[PDB]
């Protein structure tokens, strides 16, 4: 339409952790608009051009001893150092989920406001597992350090039927079981 | 791609010519730990647990963003003034908990695939704008170097209020109203 | 108690 012109620049200093502190990897990304043109990979140890737009940057950054040494050391001063603070805060955050069944013929099991992301939801009709008519949304990120997931079950409810939703989460010692009975 | 148990963006740096505007933030597993108010020179953590034990000097963000401003001018000339491509944003509206008539809740408007990172996100209670109870997050990064933004609206569920999330973006032809 | 850092952005070639 009548959109103004815009030029975007991004820089991302990303750390990848595995096996606690055993495996650490640093990848800094220099992005013009949405094109990553240069990067530093700690597994490589030098800057590399990603597109024809960053040979001048990679050659200059690799020729400057101060830049390459500072970037090489950031695997310890940034990734490993800040991870020790994650062990004491983020990696210990446990928020237990709230499980609710709502009729919609569809039956929706809502699992809301939990952290971390690992979650397990299963449907049962009279203690027998249901899989054929089960839809689950992807993990919904609320953006406030809590997650959400919706698991729906297509049902033809009879009399005496007891539909249950079984939920497992790392913050729970036992699974949460919520029942639902037709009226 | 890179396989890892935990991914942290210790430096989501952003600077664009429209404004001009910038943003600095740290992320861990897709969630925002803090952002630095570049105008106030202040670190704003996103959880009480972070404000208690964690510290970050806002001067580091002002120093990095000043470099991105210098780098942007250099790559603009090198690319023969190649402008950014406006993408089509995807909007989704939902509640943080199952809405029970009479119990306070919160509506969540997820604006995904935002590029360039310039967007207007506002709510509408009926056909009129809302001011109280509206808050949003910072531009959160994606692996494809686009962004997504989340806006929140606290509300009291009633049988007569039908809410809308109006999103304005250059990749759209008209303001997108997603209904709830 | 101790300030943590981010990644340092390296400068481009332009003067």
């Amino acid at each position, epitope marked *: 339409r009548d959109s103004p012109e815009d030029f975007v620049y991004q820089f991302k200093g990303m750390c990848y952790f595995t096996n606690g502190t055993e495996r650490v990897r640093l990848v800094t990304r220099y992005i013009y608009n949405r094109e990553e043109y240069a990067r530093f990979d700690s597994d490589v140890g030098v800057y590399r051009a990603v597109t024809p737009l960053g040979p001048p940057a990679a050659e200059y950054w690799n020729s400057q001893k101060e830049v390459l040494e*500072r970037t090489r050391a950031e695997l310890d*001063t940034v990734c490993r*150092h800040n991870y020790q603070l994650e062990l004491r805060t983020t990696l210990q955050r446990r928020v237990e989920p709230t499980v609710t069944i709502s009729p919609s013929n569809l039956l929706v099991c809502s699992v809301t406001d939990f952290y971390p992301a690992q979650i397990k939801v299963r449907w049962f009709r009279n203690d027998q597992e249901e899989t054929t008519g089960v839809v689950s949304t992807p993990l919904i990120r609320n953006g406030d350090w809590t997650f959400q997931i919706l698991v729906m079950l297509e049902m033809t409810p009879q009399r005496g039927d007891v539909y249950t939703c079984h939920v497992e989460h790392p913050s729970l010692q036992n699974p949460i079981i919520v029942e639902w009975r037709a009226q | 791609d890179i396989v890892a148990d935990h991914v942290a963006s210790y430096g989501v740096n952003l600077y664009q010519s429209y404004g001009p505007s910038g943003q600095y933030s740290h992320e861990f597993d897709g969630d925002e730990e803090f952002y630095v108010d570049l105008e106030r020179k202040e670190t704003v953590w996103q959880l009480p647990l972070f404000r208690r034990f964690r510290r970050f000097d806002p001067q*580091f963000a002002l120093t990095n963003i*000043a*470099v991105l401003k210098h780098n942007l001018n250099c790559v603009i000339k090198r690319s023969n003034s190649t402008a950014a491509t406006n993408e089509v944003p995807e909007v989704t509206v939902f509640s943080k908990s199952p809405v029970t008539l009479g119990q306070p809740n919160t509506l969540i408007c997820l604006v995904d695939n935002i590029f360039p990172p310039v967007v207007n996100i506002t709510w509408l209670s009926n056909g009129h704008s809302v001011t109280e109870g509206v808050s949003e997050t910072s531009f959160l990064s994606k692996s494809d170097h686009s962004f997504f933004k989340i806006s929140y609206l606290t509300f009291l569920p009633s049988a007569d209020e039908i809410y809308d999330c109006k999103v304005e973006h250059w990749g759209l032809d008209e303001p997108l109203l997603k209904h709830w | 108690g101790q300030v943590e*850092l981010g990644g340092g952005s*390296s*400068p481009e070639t332009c003067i």
Partner: T-cell receptor
Amino acid sequence: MKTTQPPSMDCAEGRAANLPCNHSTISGNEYVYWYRQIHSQGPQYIIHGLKNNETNEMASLIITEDRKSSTLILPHATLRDTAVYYCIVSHNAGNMLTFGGGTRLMVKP
Amino acid sequence: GVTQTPRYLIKTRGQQVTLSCSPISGHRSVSWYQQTPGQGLQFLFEYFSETQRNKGNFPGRFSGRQFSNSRSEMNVSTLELGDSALYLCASSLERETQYFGPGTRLLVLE
């Protein structure tokens, strides 16, 4: 600041000068920097390091394993080495430098 | 490496001065400090890409500027007796090791 040094120190010319520096509250993302300033001059950069040992043409820097202290080794003290030596810390994040009292080294022949 | 002009300076109260600094060839960051026997090494401001990036706690009468070739100037207006000091210039490639110049020894008299 974060570093403490002896205010004065003597050394014989031609021998090695070991200058101590204590910094128990140093962080893991902070480098140890060493500067010196001859009278009526500006500060001269000497050496810096993060962990353990670093050397150059001017001196050697040995940081202990726990990083709570470090030593600046001047291999063969000369008359020109008579100056005030500053042991400081820095994040190398483009921020200001902070100097302390420093050690007034006197090289006596 | 780093050069500063002038080397020495004599001024009276109320006057102004302009101190110049040329960083090491290739360096983009220029820092200004004030060194006194009483207060030590006090930071003024740091410039990168013709813009002030870091700011100290000195009043508004202490101002600086950086040019296209990374050379930097520093101005002190309505000088005071307590402004007598060695004004040092430190150059850095961008954020790493800072290399100081000889400095300008300023003396303010009545």
